[PDB]
Amino acid sequence: MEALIPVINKLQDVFNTVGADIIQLPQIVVVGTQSSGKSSVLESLVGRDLLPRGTGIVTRRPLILQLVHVSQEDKRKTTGEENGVEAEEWGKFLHTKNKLYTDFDEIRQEIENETERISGNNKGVSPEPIHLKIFSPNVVNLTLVDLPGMTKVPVGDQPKDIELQIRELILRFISNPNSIILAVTAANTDMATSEALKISREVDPDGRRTLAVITKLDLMDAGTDAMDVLMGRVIPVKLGIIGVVNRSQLDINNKKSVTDSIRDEYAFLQKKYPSLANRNGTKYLARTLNRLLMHHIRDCLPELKTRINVLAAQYQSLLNSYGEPVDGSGSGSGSKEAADMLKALQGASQIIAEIRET
């Protein structure tokens, strides 16, 4: 069976700067607040540190994190220059193309060196996603689209006007009918007022395409647990409620391994939620997400294939509606967009066509 996650992965890369919203690609979108621990969720799935936290302040553009599983025998010569130790894990950024990152702290640096910046226009929000492939024998095949974290308070209850732009960005990504919403909220807070769930009901009134992750189960008050939320008694999300306890900042600084953290996570779930421990934790989360993404992709595959063809026809006609000049130094802004789109649509259709097995 041809794995379909690598296929959409390539489709995501194809519509990198030419606009992917109109394609409506099947993908998981991570929506969370700034203090929800959603960045810890990503790293728990990765297996080690990757994302720049907020020593002072956090990220300002989407990160398409593509975890690609490999055999432990599948390795890479360490670069940039000198030898000879061989790497078991490596990363690739789309903007740097075939450059190889063996030092995972250099990957973090590149994310920093690529997030925000006084580039282009307006202020610090770019809906331009960063594309990152992580090759590892410790990850399951999984792709997540990480969006900038919201404020834990409503937008009106904080001073910065740029928070509106963050809310717009998130809505832009999750209004995609074929997008699965991964809403990350800490048990540390009051669930029925979570900004993550609030903004998710605006595009998905029902819980029909939203999955809720409950983090920081070990930080709840005295004499209080997350039994009702984890039993599915309060939060109106339909793809399931999954509770985890990731590494804290203390643990990261104390260099606690993710293997040791999932061990303690496991012990915690067994202790406090014995009747539910089997359907919670990082290991359960990673693989439910893998299967759900696989099932969701092939459901959308037929309708996605024709949409690329239909779009190509509409774009072709749009250029016939356009006219001149076809010549030399200037295309103009709009006609070049249609031309570049058709090129991407061509590359997209080719990728789909290469899917074998009748």
Numbering used by the authors: 1 to 327, 703 to 733
What did the paper state?
The stalk (S), which participates in higher-order oligomerization, and the B-insert were replaced by a GSGSGSGS linker, which continued with the C-terminal helix of the BSE.
Apparently, the citrate compensates charges in the active site of DNM1L, while the GMP-PNP occupied active site exhibits a distinct conformation in the P-loop and switch I. In GMP-PNP-DNM1L, the side chain of Arg53 extends to the bulk solvent above the GTP-binding groove, whereas in the nucleotide-free form, this side chain is hydrogen-bonded to Ser40 and Glu43, in a position similar to that of the nucleotide-loaded dynamin complex. This translocation in the nucleotide-free state may be an artificial charge compensation for the negative charge of the P-loop bound citrate. Interestingly, the water molecule in our nucleotide-free DNM1L GG construct is in the same position as the catalytic water in dynamin-1. This catalytic water connects switch I with switch II via hydrogen bonds to the Thr59 carbonyl oxygen and the Gly149 NH, respectively. The overall root mean square deviation (RMSD) between the nucleotide-free and –bound DNM1L GG construct is only 0.69 Å for the Cα atoms, indicating almost identical structures. The BSE is formed by the N-terminal helices α1B (residues 4–16) and α1AB, helix α2B (303–323) and the C-terminal helix α3B (708–729, with residues S708GS710 from the artificial linker), arranged in a three-helix bundle with an additional one-turn helix. Both our structures represent the closed conformation of the BSE in relation to the GTPase domain, which has been called the “post-fission state”.
